[PDB]
Design a protein around this ligand. Structure first.
Ligand code: BCL
Ligand code: BCL
Ligand code: BCL
Ligand code: BCL
Ligand code: BCL
Ligand code: BCL
Ligand SMILES: CC(C)=CCC/C(C)=C\CC/C(C)=C/CC/C(C)=C\CC/C(C)=C/CC/C(C)=C/CC/C(C)=C/CC/C(C)=C/CC1=C(C)C(=O)c2ccccc2C1=O
Ligand SMILES: CCCCCC/C=C\CCCCCCCCCC(=O)O[C@H](COC(=O)CCCCCCCCCCCCCCC)COP(=O)(O)OC[C@@H](O)CO
Ligand SMILES: CCCCCC/C=C\CCCCCCCCCC(=O)O[C@H](COC(=O)CCCCCCCCCCCCCCC)COP(=O)(O)OC[C@@H](O)CO
Ligand SMILES: COC(C)(C)CCC/C(C)=C/C=C/C(C)=C/C=C/C(C)=C/C=C/C=C(C)/C=C/C=C(C)/C=C/C=C(\C)CCCC(C)(C)OC
Ligand SMILES: COC(C)(C)CCC/C(C)=C/C=C/C(C)=C/C=C/C(C)=C/C=C\C=C(C)\C=C\C=C(C)\C=C\C=C(/C)CCCC(C)(C)OC
Ligand SMILES: [Ca+2]
Lengths: 257, 42, 66, 318, 73, 78, 272, 42, 72, 44, 43, 43
């Protein structure tokens, strides 16, 4: 009879319902784990008052990370360290309007140039030593020939001008690889540039840094001690180079078409 | 001392463990006698 | 055989029918015929399963070849 | 343009790293580590050393016995000729027993070698499971990689051992080939009326598409903030920097909600595991509970109904 | 030798971990138990489906109550 | 003799690894030989000696590949 | 609502079209010119799908279907009730997808990051355009594309597959499936590893990068690295999409036999 | 002492291990005698 | 030479590792043993199924008990 | 320089003694099993 | 230079025992083949 | 410059034994082929 039916309820049906309920429930738990960073959120009210809201579903109860080498406990969701001192002016009088920096945009720490407030300790290896270090402190590293050694090259800066010269390489001992280039700038300071913002040309013996301009290499943040770097300093350096992607030229933040 | 239990604690645990296992096996035997009376399989 | 097909199987060859030329096409032995396929050469104690070869008559698949 | 971070431009070498110290009572690691320049263009350059203990040797004996059996039967099927082996390689296979033998142990050249290879491959994968568990647990880590591996092993055993036993025939299992196992896939869809109307098949396809989507999204997002140190996820988890902040603002602004640097890895875990859970559920019900998936879908109001215009006469009714 | 050749044997546990070995033995024994039961069930010696001492599904199909109900239809 | 110093073997070959290899290999080889002998004419579980214990099929053909799934259990194919 | 740390990043600039007119947020979303475009096109497309369901036989969610024109229309313009609605919706869909990608580019420029995600999205867009534009143009008719309906685009997939007798033997299809499977495996291993390192055995410290390398070198003998696994991920997903597009542009335009017969070039090499 | 056990601890473990293995094999033999009485296979 | 040609041969183990060689030899021999046994079992020289010195399945099918049970 | 296992020569002698005894006992049991099997079901 | 750390005396010792063992193994192989030829000649 | 650390004396020694071994191996190969031709000629 080709399509005769004996009974409407079967096992495939029930099992499908069970799956709909088993999904729909890992969504719940994952969405709750999503809110251990950045919450409670700030909802702005009808006439400017700000309250803390928590969303749907609600925030989870705090858990603890025990960091190694007596690096302390981290509770999440927990307290926050205080923001620094960014200045901003709103552009249009409603909660969803954008903001403008008030002073020199490069030295303001807002927009792509914002950074976080991390610990003032270096990241450690499994043995307790600082992880990112110059190649004169890590005496066992060597650049593989077949590859252009950047030490000596110049640091052209996106408008064609010279920034300085490369004098050191900063390596990562936990995973052997290059993280920073150190260079002497135009006013004879020592500044770092991340290796992921550098195009290295071996034959021209140049390093092109498209982010900032040549004269901008004088105001890159500096380090305390030059035998190690801390989490805070990493953030400051990288953020300064990221501010130039929108603030270097006055025409960069200005609608392509 | 690999588990942190002393020898007295181990003796105590062993006593109760053996009693519990014996009771469990007793219940199993009873279930099988009932099943044989109802539906013999060999 | 040709008379039988032309008269009794019109559910398939409906009013067009067949002649010799439909298969011989001017040759004594037709071009596309078949026989019971023995399969490739394998050891003598191995029976044929009838598949997993190239399979020229089943469109070059690894399907059963006869 | 700007550096995209796809290849390593400058490489550096130090002496090889032997590995985190193991608990006392362990065997040494075997091998002297070597370095690959081409592997170092895209990733880590060190190869080795390797840990071989009790469970990973029993595994590797089982697996190689299985491989020898499979290879030799494929080679006997062409008459021992290696030239023909290379010529027709994608069409060769080791075939399961004829379905009329049921669940008995058949003679060796009519399905017994298939049975042997299946048994040895099974044992290999269970010993490997124990190895993976112990390796992660001896270093003091959570055992999350063993849970996912267990799911995958269960899918291998379902199609292959559990479903053939519940059906009553070993001849319901896949063979060991390339084109032969593709033929098995098509035939089991044809026999049980169209897998496109199996709902667990649709859900697992949803999760396989989703795995590709999610991993393109995550791989992109972490390469796009690696200029702010985003590729170092453990530190961004235990001390949130600007890379994590930018990464979570991007998705919040784009689609209205976001995850954190630790939570996205739970989304990954689940999207990879639900795919295979639905695979198991869809295969285990086929044949044993449902005999035609299209007729099932018609009974439950799922299949569309194209207009007809004609009438075709079923010749078995005439 | 041949009478006192196996006197050092107790030293085995100074190179092999006892708890690991115990766990390995237990797991292997359980796996082998399941395997041999499945191998014997798939032969002529099968004892669940041999219908000895009686077939029970067939016994249920031929009960007088079931027969009288199947007659009425 | 020529085999006077053989015991020095264990000074460069690890005896723990040797033991772990040998035990595994012997157990696996045991399983293998049993399955190989069971898949032949020397099989001793379903050979009908000293008696056939199951209600086997009265006329069981020689099974071919183009076959359906059997309705009842059977273990006497020959 | 704003996150705890969000306010210092909500600055103006970074746009492609428009300028200061559409540079605002609505709730958590960022709008822009392309945000307006995307929502416009999504709303219009959805409403037209619903109307095409209203003039059909049923409003059951599983059985709605809007079909493309016949093959006799060619690359022309079909009546509204016999194909033109499908054409309008397929214009809306392209508009919405491209808008989505460009909005992503604006957002990434504002936050100071690289354009990897819109670039990977481009390959999904390319596969869609292969199925609705390139393959139909090369074969000479819009009516070679798929209808819009759950369960009803699956009938299309099935019959198109069987137009070549056995679609599993398509070579680019094999390569794409390889990439899909390996991608799911890699994603499972990556998820598991990070979870395992920040959620260790009870009463232990968070582990390090050395642990991550050691575990996979112990199990398998090689570890790819924490930054290269993200690369490997972008690579496997993009390649899956790419070879899907190739496999569909081959079927019909460049090959009309069965797919098993293509492979015949291999055992016919004069070298065995 | 690659396992940390001294020679006394090893002797102790060996004693109990051998006793347990003997008891287990005894139970196996008993099971096989019952099976031979019920359904002889050779 | 022809008699003093192989004099320094014992020096071989100053450039070839003894442990690697031992392990390689053992593993290769086991693999080859399995392979040759499987190749010979798949030919006319097969010794398990040749029904020599007697066929055992056939012997079991024709026992008087089995014959009397099959007769009904 | 050279690959070693840390065993002295006395420890190696001890291990070798017990290893050879165990292997001999195992092979004895194997021979016995095969004599029984030949008596029950001769294969050559 | 590639080296194994064995001196010349250690190499001589190893070589002695290696050759003895290989000879014994080949002897056993020959015996197995003589028995097989007596039972089932293959050429 | 690519070098193996062997002096010229060490190379001479190695070469002597290498050539002797290769000659012996080829001798055994020739013997095997003469036997095979006597048993089952293939050309
Ligand atoms: C023809 C076959 C018979 C049959 C033959 C047998 C035989 C034989 C046995 C069982 C046993 C069980 N059967 Mg029964 N059983 C049948 C039909 C059923 C049906 C049904 C829906 O048809 C159900 C639901 C059950 C359920 C049960 C469980 C109560 C019990 C399994 C326990 C277990 O899994 O330990 C798993 C969990 C643990 C071991 C944890 C340890 C104990 C913990 C602390 C708590 C457990 C409480 C325990 C479950 C209940 C006993 C408490 C008493 C009230 C005192 N049977 C049919 C009618 N059944 C077993 C049994 O009774 O055990 C003694 C048993 O040996
Ligand atoms: C009988 C049928 C044949 C078969 C016939 C076909 C046909 C026909 C096709 C495939 C195609 C594919 N097949 Mg096949 N295939 C078969 C068996 C298989 C099997 C298997 C296990 O047997 C597997 C694993 C596959 C796997 C695959 C993939 C390689 C490929 C699908 C991925 C893809 O196209 O991505 C590409 C991604 C897209 C097209 C997605 C587009 C994304 C758009 C831009 C975004 C949409 C957003 C949305 C509207 C927003 C909603 C928003 C809400 C708010 C949430 N096939 C059988 C043998 N297969 C397809 C292909 O390769 O096409 C290119 C294809 O056309
Ligand atoms: C025709 C064939 C016979 C049959 C012939 C045999 C033969 C022969 C043997 C068994 C054995 C077993 N059979 Mg039986 N068996 C049959 C049908 C069954 C059925 C059933 C559903 O039909 C079941 C559930 C069993 C179950 C069992 C287990 C009790 C036992 C395997 C235990 C094991 O693997 O330990 C593995 C686990 C370990 C070694 C762990 C280490 C020790 C642990 C800590 C203690 C566990 C206790 C143990 C289970 C015994 C407890 C009994 C008490 C002493 C009272 N048989 C049929 C009827 N069976 C074996 C046996 O009894 O061993 C003594 C055995 O030799
Ligand atoms: C027609 C064929 C015969 C048959 C012919 C043979 C022949 C011939 C042999 C066996 C051997 C064995 N047979 Mg039988 N066997 C038959 C039917 C069976 C059946 C069954 C379900 O029908 C079973 C379960 C067995 C099981 C066994 C094992 C006890 C033994 C394999 C030991 C091993 O695997 O190495 C395990 C080895 C190790 C782990 C390394 C060395 C062992 C050391 C010392 C430590 C392990 C502990 C202990 C000694 C383990 C073995 C227990 C006994 C005391 C031997 N046979 C039929 C009737 N069988 C072998 C044997 O007897 O070995 C002595 C053997 O030679
Ligand atoms: C028709 C063919 C004949 C047959 C013809 C041959 C021929 C010819 C040969 C064998 C050889 C072997 N055959 Mg046979 N063989 C047949 C049937 C069998 C069957 C069976 C189940 O049917 C089995 C299980 C075996 C098993 C074996 C192994 C013992 C042996 C391979 C050893 C090896 O690989 O060492 C690899 C391992 C190493 C090199 C490591 C060191 C060795 C270790 C320490 C000891 C291993 C066992 C040892 C040789 C014997 C015990 C020691 C002595 C008693 C002193 N044969 C049939 C009846 N067989 C070979 C052989 O025995 O050579 C000696 C061989 O030449
Ligand atoms: C119709 C074909 C003939 C046949 C014709 C030939 C011909 C012709 C030749 C062989 C050769 C060989 N045959 Mg034959 N052979 C036949 C059937 C067999 C069968 C079988 C199962 O049927 C086997 C197992 C063999 C096995 C062998 C090997 C002994 C040898 C391959 C050596 C090698 O590869 O070393 C390569 C590996 C190395 C060089 C590694 C170095 C290791 C060192 C040097 C020690 C190795 C020992 C070595 C294997 C043998 C030396 C023997 C001793 C003097 C006792 N033949 C049939 C009957 N055979 C070859 C040979 O004799 O070489 C002289 C050869 O030329
Ligand atoms: C439509 C309508 C009625 C409109 C009216 C509303 C009006 C008037 C205007 C609103 C303004 C605008 C412009 C809105 C547009 C938005 C609209 C309407 C719709 C879009 C919503 C949308 C497309 C959502 C789809 C969501 C889905 C299904 C996502 C699939 C993938 C998925 C399940 C992901 C979950 C995991 C997540 C959250 C991944 C993101 C994520 C990844 C991938 C990381 O790598 C990462 C790394 C480090 C930290 C964080 C992250 C992170 O969060
Ligand atoms: C007298 C006889 C001499 C025997 C002496 C050796 C003792 C027996 C083995 C020792 C042992 O059982 O050890 C275990 C090996 O497991 C293993 O073989 C596991 C493999 C054992 C079984 C091999 C065959 C597999 C059986 C079938 C599959 C079982 C599947 C179960 C999976 C869940 C664990 O190994 P490790 O913890 O890495 O080792 C540490 C120290 O012990 C040695 O450095
Ligand atoms: C980039 C990918 C494609 C590149 C390869 C193009 C090469 C060959 C394509 C031409 C093959 C088309 C199919 C020929 C067979 C089918 C019949 C056909 O249509 O071929 C001709 C049309 O060629 C045509 O469009 C030709 C139109 C080709 C224009 C392609 C340019 C694309 C750019 C558009 C971007 C916006 C003949 O047309 P007619 O029959 O008069 O039309 C009648 C119906 O269409 C409408 O009533
Ligand atoms: C601190 O401790 C110190 C070191 C100081 C003192 C310690 C002393 C102690 C505790 C020592 C303990 C020693 C022990 C317990 C030693 C155990 C030794 C044993 C049991 C050795 C047995 C060895 C068995 C061998 C080598 C068998 C090998 C068989 C082989 C290779 C067969 C191959 C067969 C083939 C290839 C046939 C295949 C046929 C077919 C048909 C299957 O092929 C397809
Ligand atoms: C010439 O080659 C040599 C010999 C030199 C070696 C080279 C090896 C090579 C080239 C191998 C090539 C291998 C290939 C191409 C393999 C292809 C494999 C594929 C694609 C396989 C796909 C699927 C197979 C599956 C899913 C099988 C599943 C089987 C299972 C789960 C078996 C279960 C059986 C069990 C657990 C045993 C029960 C038995 C018993 C005894 C209990 O029954 C009663
Ligand atoms: Ca025989």
């Amino acid at each position: 009879e080709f399509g005769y039916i004996t009974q409407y309820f079967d096992l495939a049906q029930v099992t499908l319902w069970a799956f709909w309920l088993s999904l729909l429930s890992v969504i719940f738990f994952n969405r709750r784990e999503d809110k251990r960073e950045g919450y409670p959120q700030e909802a702005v009210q009808i006439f400017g008052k700000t309250i803390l809201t928590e969303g749907f579903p609600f925030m989870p109860a705090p858990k603890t990370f025990k960091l190694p080498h007596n690096g302390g406990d981290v509770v999440k969701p927990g307290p926050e360290r205080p923001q620094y001192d960014f200045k901003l002016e709103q552009v249009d009088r409603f909660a969803g309007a954008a903001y403008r920096p008030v002073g020199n945009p490069m030295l303001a720490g807002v927009g792509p140039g914002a950074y976080a407030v991390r610990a003032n300790k270096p990241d450690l290896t499994n043995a307790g030593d600082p992880r990112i270090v110059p190649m004169r402190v890590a005496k066992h590293f060597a650049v593989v020939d077949k590859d252009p050694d950047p030490r000596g090259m110049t640091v052209i800066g996106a408008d064609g001008q010279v920034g300085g010269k490369v004098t050191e390489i900063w390596v990562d001992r936990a995973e052997p690889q290059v993280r920073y280039l150190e260079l002497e700038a135009g006013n004879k300071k020592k500044v770092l540039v991340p290796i992921a913002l550098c195009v290295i040309k071996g034959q021209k013996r140049e390093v092109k840094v498209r982010s900032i301009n040549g004269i901008h290499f004088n105001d890159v943040p500096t380090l305390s001690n030059y035998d190690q770097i801390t989490l805070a300093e990493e953030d400051k350096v990288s953020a300064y180079y990221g501010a130039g992607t929108l603030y270097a030229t006055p025409n960069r933040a200005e609608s392509v078409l | 001392s690999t588990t942190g239990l002393t020898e007295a604690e181990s003796k105590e645990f062993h006593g109760i463990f053996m009693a519990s296992m014996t009771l469990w096996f007793g219940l199993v035997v009873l279930a099988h006698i009932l099943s044989w009376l109802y539906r013999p399989w060999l | 055989m040709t008379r039988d097909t032309n008269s009794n199987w019109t559910g398939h060859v409906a009013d067009t029918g067949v002649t010799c030329y439909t298969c011989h096409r001017g040759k004594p032995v037709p071009e596309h015929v078949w026989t019971t396929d023995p399969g490739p050469d394998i050891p003598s104690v191995f029976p044929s399963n009838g598949q997993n070869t190239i399979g020229y008559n089943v469109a070059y698949t690894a399907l059963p070849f006869d | 343009p700007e550096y995209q971070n796809i290849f390593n431009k400058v490489q550096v070498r130090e002496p090889a790293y032997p590995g985190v110290e193991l608990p006392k009572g362990s065997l040494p690691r075997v091998g002297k580590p070597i370095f690959s320049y081409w592997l170092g263009k895209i990733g880590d350059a060190q190869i080795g050393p390797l840990y071989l203990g009790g469970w990973g040797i029993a595994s590797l004996i089982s697996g190689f016995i299985a491989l020898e059996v499979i290879g030799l039967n494929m080679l006997a099927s062409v008459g021992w000729d290696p030239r023909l082996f290379l010529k027709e390689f994608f069409w060769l296979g080791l075939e399961p027993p004829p379905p009329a033998y049921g669940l008995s142990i058949p003679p060796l050249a009519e399905g017994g070698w298939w049975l042997i290879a299946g048994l040895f491959l099974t044992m290999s994968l269970l010993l490997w499971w124990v190895r993976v568990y112990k390796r992660a647990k001896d270093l003091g880590m959570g055992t999350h990689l063993s849970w996912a591996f267990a799911v995958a092993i269960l899918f291998f055993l379902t199609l292959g051992f559990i479903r053939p036993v519940l059906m009553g025939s070993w001849g319901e299992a896949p063979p060991f080939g390339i084109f032969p196992h593709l033929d098995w896939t098509a035939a089991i869809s044809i026999r049980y009326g169209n897998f496109y109307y199996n709902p667990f098949h649709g859900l697992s396809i949803a999760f396989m598409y989703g795995s590709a989507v999610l991993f393109a999204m995550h791989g992109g997002t972490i390469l796009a903030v690696s200029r702010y140190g985003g590729d170092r996820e453990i530190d961004q988890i235990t001390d949130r920097g600007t890379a994590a902040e930018r990464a979570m603002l991007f998705w919040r602004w784009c689609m209205g909600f976001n995850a954190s640097m630790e939570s996205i890895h739970r989304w990954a875990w689940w999207f990879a595991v639900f795919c295979i859970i639905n695979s198991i559920l869809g295969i285990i019900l086929t044949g044993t509970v449902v005999d035609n998936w299209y007729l099932w879908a018609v009974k439950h109001g799922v299949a569309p109904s194209y207009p007809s215009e004609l009438t075709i006469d079923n010749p078995y009714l005439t | 030798m041949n009478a006192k050749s196996f006197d050092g044997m107790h030293k085995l546990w100074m190179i092999m971990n006892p708890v690991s070995t115990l766990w390995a033995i237990f797991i292997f024994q359980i796996f082998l138990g399941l395997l041999i039961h499945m191998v014997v069930l798939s032969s002529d010696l099968n004892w669940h489906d041999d219908q000895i001492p009686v077939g029970y599904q067939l016994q249920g199909e031929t009960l007088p109550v079931n027969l009288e109900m199947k007659a009425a239809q | 003799d020529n085999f006077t110093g053989t015991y020095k073997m264990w000074m460069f070959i690890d005896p723990r690894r040797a033991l772990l290899f040998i035990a595994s290999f012997q157990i696996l080889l045991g399983i293998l030989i049993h399955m190989i002998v069971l898949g032949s004419d020397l099989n001793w579980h379903s050979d009908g000696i000293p008696k056939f214990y199951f209600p086997n099929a009265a006329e069981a053909s020689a099974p071919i590949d183009m076959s359906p799934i059997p309705s009842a259990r059977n273990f006497k194919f020959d | 609502a704003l996150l705890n740390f969000e306010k210092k990043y909500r600055v103006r600039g970074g746009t492609l079209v428009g300028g200061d007119l559409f540079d605002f947020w609505v709730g958590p979303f960022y709008v822009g010119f392309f945000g307006v475009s995307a929502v416009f096109f999504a709303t219009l497309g959805t409403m037209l799908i619903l109307f095409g369901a209203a003039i059909g036989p049923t409003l059951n969610i599983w059985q709605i279907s809007i079909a493309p024109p016949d093959l006799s229309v060619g690359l022309g313009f079909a009546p509204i009730r016999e194909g033109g609605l499908w054409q309008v919706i397929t214009i809306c869909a392209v508009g919405a997808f491209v808008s989505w990608a460009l909005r992503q580019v604006e957002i990434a420029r504002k936050l100071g990051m690289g354009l990897h995600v819109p670039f990977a999205f481009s390959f999904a867009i390319l596969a869609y355009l292969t199925l609705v534009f390139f393959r139909p143009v090369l074969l000479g008719a819009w009516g070679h594309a798929f209808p819009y309906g759950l369960f009803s685009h699956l009938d299309w997939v099935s019959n198109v597959g069987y137009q070549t007798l056995h679609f599993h033997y398509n070579p680019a299809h094999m390569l794409a499936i390889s990439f899909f499977f390996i991608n799911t495996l890699a994603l499972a291993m990556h998820g598991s590893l990070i979870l395992s390192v920040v959620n260790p055995q009870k009463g232990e410290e968070v582990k390090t990068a050395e642990h991550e390398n050691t575990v996979f070198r112990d199990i398998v003998g090689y570890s790819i690295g924490a930054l290269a696994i993200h690369r490997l991920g972008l690579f496997l997903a993009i390649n899956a999409a790419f070879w899907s597009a190739v496999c569909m542009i081959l079927t019909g335009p460049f090959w009309t036999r069965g797919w098993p017969e293509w492979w015949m070039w291999w055992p016919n090499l004069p070298i065995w």
